[PDB]
Amino acid sequence: MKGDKKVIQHLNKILGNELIAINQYFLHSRMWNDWGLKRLGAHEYHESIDEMKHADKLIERILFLEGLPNLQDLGKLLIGENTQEMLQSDLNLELCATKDLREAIVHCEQVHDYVSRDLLKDILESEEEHIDYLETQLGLIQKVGLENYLQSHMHE
Amino acid sequence: MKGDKKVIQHLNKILGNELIAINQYFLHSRMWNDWGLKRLGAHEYHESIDEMKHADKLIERILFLEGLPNLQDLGKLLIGENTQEMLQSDLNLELCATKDLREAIVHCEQVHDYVSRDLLKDILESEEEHIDYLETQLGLIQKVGLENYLQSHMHE
Amino acid sequence: MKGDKKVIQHLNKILGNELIAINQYFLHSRMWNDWGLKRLGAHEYHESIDEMKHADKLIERILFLEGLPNLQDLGKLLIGENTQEMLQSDLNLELCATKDLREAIVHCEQVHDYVSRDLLKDILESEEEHIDYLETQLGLIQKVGLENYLQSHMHE
Amino acid sequence: MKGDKKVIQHLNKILGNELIAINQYFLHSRMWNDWGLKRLGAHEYHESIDEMKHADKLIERILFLEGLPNLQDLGKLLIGENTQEMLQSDLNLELCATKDLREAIVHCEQVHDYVSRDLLKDILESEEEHIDYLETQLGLIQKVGLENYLQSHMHE
Amino acid sequence: MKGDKKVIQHLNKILGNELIAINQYFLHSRMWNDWGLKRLGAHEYHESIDEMKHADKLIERILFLEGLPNLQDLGKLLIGENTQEMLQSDLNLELCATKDLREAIVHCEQVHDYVSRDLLKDILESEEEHIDYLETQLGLIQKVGLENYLQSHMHE
Amino acid sequence: MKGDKKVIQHLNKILGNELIAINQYFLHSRMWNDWGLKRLGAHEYHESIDEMKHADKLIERILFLEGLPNLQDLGKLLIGENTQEMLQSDLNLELCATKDLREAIVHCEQVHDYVSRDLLKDILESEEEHIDYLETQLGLIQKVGLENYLQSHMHE
Amino acid sequence: MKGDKKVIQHLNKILGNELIAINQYFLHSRMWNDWGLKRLGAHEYHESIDEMKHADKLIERILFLEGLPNLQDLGKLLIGENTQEMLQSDLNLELCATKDLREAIVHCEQVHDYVSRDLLKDILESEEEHIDYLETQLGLIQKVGLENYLQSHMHE
Ligand code: HEM
Ligand code: HEM
Ligand code: HEM
Ligand SMILES: [Fe+2]
Ligand SMILES: [Fe+2]
Ligand SMILES: [Fe+2]
Ligand SMILES: [Fe+2]
Ligand SMILES: [Fe+2]
Ligand SMILES: [Fe+2]
Ligand SMILES: [Fe+2]
Ligand SMILES: [Fe+2]
Ligand SMILES: [Fe+2]
Ligand SMILES: [Fe+2]
Ligand SMILES: [Fe+2]
Ligand SMILES: [Fe+2]
Ligand SMILES: [Fe+2]
Ligand SMILES: [Fe+2]
Ligand SMILES: [Fe+2]
Ligand SMILES: [Fe+2]
Ligand SMILES: [Fe+2]
Ligand SMILES: [Fe+2]
Ligand SMILES: [Fe+2]
Ligand SMILES: [Fe+2]
Ligand SMILES: [Fe+2]
Ligand SMILES: [Fe+2]
Ligand SMILES: [Fe+2]
Ligand SMILES: [Fe+2]
Ligand SMILES: [Fe+2]
Ligand SMILES: [Fe+2]
Ligand SMILES: [Fe+2]
Ligand SMILES: [Fe+2]
Ligand SMILES: [Fe+2]
Ligand SMILES: [Fe+2]
Ligand SMILES: [Fe+2]
Ligand SMILES: [Fe+2]
Ligand SMILES: [Fe+2]
Ligand SMILES: [Fe+2]
Ligand SMILES: [Fe+2]
Ligand SMILES: [Fe+2]
Ligand SMILES: [Fe+2]
Ligand SMILES: [Fe+2]
Ligand SMILES: [Fe+2]
Ligand SMILES: [Fe+2]
Ligand SMILES: [Fe+2]
Ligand SMILES: [Fe+2]
Ligand SMILES: [Fe+2]
Ligand SMILES: [Fe+2]
Ligand SMILES: [Fe+2]
Ligand SMILES: [Fe+2]
Ligand SMILES: [Fe+2]
Ligand SMILES: [Fe+2]
Ligand SMILES: [Fe+2]
Ligand SMILES: [Fe+2]
Ligand SMILES: [Fe+2]
Ligand SMILES: [Fe+2]
Ligand SMILES: [Fe+2]
Ligand SMILES: [Fe+2]
Ligand SMILES: [Fe+2]
Ligand SMILES: [Fe+2]
Ligand SMILES: [Fe+2]
Ligand SMILES: [Fe+2]
Ligand SMILES: [Fe+2]
Ligand SMILES: [Fe+2]
Ligand SMILES: [Fe+2]
Ligand SMILES: [Fe+2]
Ligand SMILES: [Fe+2]
Ligand SMILES: [Fe+2]
Ligand SMILES: [K+]
């Protein structure tokens, strides 16, 4: 089925965001694991897997619409040097991603691509859960202190 | 994540409706049970539990959006004195609730809060099922007669 | 069997205290969950459920005695802004509520409503366990430190 | 142990009431069964078994207190001729029984026989459940009509 | 079905004997239990249950024959003060009961109420088993001595 | 938040009685076991465990009320030299315990400490069971003779 | 056939030490439980049970040797006011106990009561495990800090 070219362009923009998030989260996960903060590593890995699944659904939708998925362009990773920086960088990336998702949903509604809208809404629900996770961890660092927070995320 | 203040105000309005419905339905349930109309009591209890779960989701969403859930303000319960009045009072309350849900959905769409919209749509689907249940019971009272209808709802 | 009018007034007063506690504890529970303090959130949810069950038993007893349960009047919630304030606010509520239970039991005894007395005694046993829980947590904060206490109530 | 002679007199009065209820409810049960109203018959049999178990506990307590259980004196049975009369006669009997139970509890409290008081309170809780059952059935006859009420209690 | 009025009178006489035996044996059972003679108490309870089941069948038959079961008139209980007296009092009661059963069977045969006769014969077989039990226990007291007999019926 | 000072004194008095009974019954148990009267020894051990559990509940209650449990003061043990004396000494001790329990319950009721009252009533129910056990054993010695009574309590 | 009088005196001295430890550790256990330090409370309860089992074995041995177990004389409990004092007071008590055990073993060896010696050696092995437990906890307080130590012993 021949999709709207601007919808396909929006879907490729979302896909591009997923690709940044996959790599940033995977590396953050393996950094936490390397440091012996295995619970943080495992949860960051789970976030990376979520983004892999979002990318998959986007690729499948673009192909159905007769578009060309762009897996070539990888935007800027902002890798942190410590736990607080890593969490904040992830959170900043998620906030950029939801902004793009909302603009893509607007466009899908405008051209009556309600199935793409619903896919993007499902991804946006997941991203807001990611934002909730990351905001909550930064808040816990303040409430229990950094050393305790890290201690609680050492052992799986 | 910092939510739109008018969306949060709409969510608290919906929450307020849930709180009325929880108490009205719980008391109606226990009145039917007290009268020995246990099947009616059990179904009304189920409705009250549905509204408890709606309230829960609304509270969680308001907190995520950095709003303050209002569990203090309880609107007017209209407790019936017999089965027909109790069902009709519930139905009137549901019809008020769906009106508020539609206005809240309009606002979420306007400001691109698509995750809150989808939550409210899910609640609205449940409320229309509640309306269907209550309308159907009032119709059955007409078709089988009040005495038979009550008889059929005595024993679980 | 018509119950004593002042006994029914007392039961409605106890019921009113339960309705305050249901909402305050439910909101405190969801606040703790929102902050990622899930062990605190779960325990507070089970306190809320306990009060819901108290309210149910009182409603059933009032109806049996041919009184009108009052679910319309909701007294003042006191929502804390951090863990210490939330625990202290719950403790304030419980201490005020047990004072009313004792006065209600006195009245039941005076008019020989021994079944209502035993119901209120069972609720009072639960409220003193709730007081014990709350006082103990506040004491643990003093013994292990606030940051450690919150750490220990982060993960379920 | 040597019980208070007036307490033993109260316990024998309660036992006397149980013996009336056992026989009245057993006969009402078998009359309902005879008429093909088997659900009514089964519930009335259950009430009769409850009173047998009350009598057993009272006999045991009287003997422990070195009293003589009185199973010789059987008071007045009032056997109804139709369902409404039978239920109302049972209800009248239960209301007489609770009046005697409250006077007995007063006396146990006066002489500090707290264990006998707790037994009598357990019996009283059961009789108030019996009263609730009987009142509820009389109310259902009004709400669903006598013919429907009987129909619903034909088949087990 | 319309029973013979003299047969119904006989059945009510048998029922009257059952009602005496129920109460006498239940009290003897609880006296033996009170004394710590639990095997004697359990067997006497079993005898009491047998008489309850006899009474039930007689009530059912009387009602089928369109008679009025008489549970109002309770004849003389003869409660013993020690084991030998209790057993002998039960035995005396059983011998009175079989005398009445034989006269009732004669009358059933005379008027061709063969189904009532067979019920009464089944009851009589049970009473002769009861007589055998009681006679045997009195004989064992002579053969093993009273102290040994009681010792053997202390523990269940 | 403290209990009533005189209630705490009563609870410590009850606790003192438990501590006497624990030690007296444990030694009596082990004397019976040493003599080869293992069924008596096992039952007496069970009585001692009951008193340990009573003491535990009292200690927990005193601490909740912010009293100081007194485990220092051990009153007079009266150890018997043979089975009859041991049983009688236990019985005398239980009768002193129930006297103190009734005085403590009066006080709890007076100051509206209804949870302490219910705890003491539960302990009192258990002590009256203990009295029943002891009185019954002494009575069995009379009915079956001492040698037979001891014989029946040799083997478990 | 009697044990040595001075061996029996030593065994009663060891028994006296057990009785102190039972009560001291049981109260310390219930204080820790009351404070919400349930893992400390559970371990201390376990220590108290060990001492109850030691006392049982000593009572059995004394009775076999035809001595009189002394459960009347309770020496001085030293109840701590906080975790460090409670642990230290337990440790001081264990060190007194092992001193008396070694003197008792010397005496058993001197008079060739090798079975009493082996029993006391088994108790001594257990007391040195108790000492190891207590010393290790005090050392952990130093290594992890008091607040962390207490935190780690809050939850079971
Ligand atoms: C009149 C006030 C209320 C009464 C008497 C009441 C009663 C109950 C009862 C009896 C249950 C079942 C508990 C059990 O058996 O475990 C229940 C479930 C529940 N209630 Fe309430 N309730 C009240 C109000 C509320 C409110 C105001 C909220 C939240 C804002 C709430 C949240 C819940 C939740 C989340 C459940 C669990 C439902 C499930 O099974 O998923 N309730 N309620
Ligand atoms: C002093 C009066 C009586 C006492 C204390 C007494 C006591 C009892 C008790 C304790 C049970 C066992 C109930 C249970 O544990 O579920 C029982 C069973 C029963 N009783 Fe009675 N009873 C009395 C008189 C009667 C009478 C007068 C009747 C009928 C006319 C009757 C009919 C029955 C029947 C049919 C059962 C069930 C037996 C079975 O099949 O297991 N009882 N009774
Ligand atoms: C302050 C006084 C005491 C208290 C509060 C106390 C408490 C307890 C409790 C709660 C139990 C567990 C019972 C159960 O749950 O079944 C127990 C077990 C036991 N107690 Fe005590 N106790 C006390 C004194 C004693 C004394 C003085 C002795 C012996 C001289 C003793 C001997 C025993 C024995 C043999 C057990 C069973 C241990 C096992 O499980 O193998 N107790 N105690
Ligand atoms: Fe590694
Ligand atoms: Fe997830
Ligand atoms: Fe994503
Ligand atoms: Fe295709
Ligand atoms: Fe666009
Ligand atoms: Fe979808
Ligand atoms: Fe994401
Ligand atoms: Fe590790
Ligand atoms: Fe592990
Ligand atoms: Fe009811
Ligand atoms: Fe549903
Ligand atoms: Fe709802
Ligand atoms: Fe948040
Ligand atoms: Fe709006
Ligand atoms: Fe959704
Ligand atoms: Fe609804
Ligand atoms: Fe029914
Ligand atoms: Fe059913
Ligand atoms: Fe969350
Ligand atoms: Fe609980
Ligand atoms: Fe409550
Ligand atoms: Fe009612
Ligand atoms: Fe009052
Ligand atoms: Fe109760
Ligand atoms: Fe509470
Ligand atoms: Fe404090
Ligand atoms: Fe975590
Ligand atoms: Fe987990
Ligand atoms: Fe029939
Ligand atoms: Fe029942
Ligand atoms: Fe009864
Ligand atoms: Fe007795
Ligand atoms: Fe009286
Ligand atoms: Fe009780
Ligand atoms: Fe009753
Ligand atoms: Fe049928
Ligand atoms: Fe059936
Ligand atoms: Fe007994
Ligand atoms: Fe049999
Ligand atoms: Fe019979
Ligand atoms: Fe018939
Ligand atoms: Fe005849
Ligand atoms: Fe037959
Ligand atoms: Fe018989
Ligand atoms: Fe025994
Ligand atoms: Fe047995
Ligand atoms: Fe032995
Ligand atoms: Fe027991
Ligand atoms: Fe006790
Ligand atoms: Fe406390
Ligand atoms: Fe006092
Ligand atoms: Fe209780
Ligand atoms: Fe006791
Ligand atoms: Fe043997
Ligand atoms: Fe054996
Ligand atoms: Fe506690
Ligand atoms: Fe151990
Ligand atoms: Fe020891
Ligand atoms: Fe010996
Ligand atoms: Fe020595
Ligand atoms: Fe050994
Ligand atoms: Fe030790
Ligand atoms: Fe905790
Ligand atoms: Fe746990
Ligand atoms: K820590």
PDB file of C-alpha atoms in Angstrom, chain D residues 17 35 99 154:
ATOM      1  CA  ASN D  17     -34.042 -21.487  74.395  1.00  0.00           C
ATOM      2  CA  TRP D  35     -43.912 -29.706  50.594  1.00  0.00           C
ATOM      3  CA  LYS D  99     -32.976 -10.683  74.892  1.00  0.00           C
ATOM      4  CA  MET D 154     -38.105 -25.421  45.508  1.00  0.00           C
TER       5      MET D 154
END
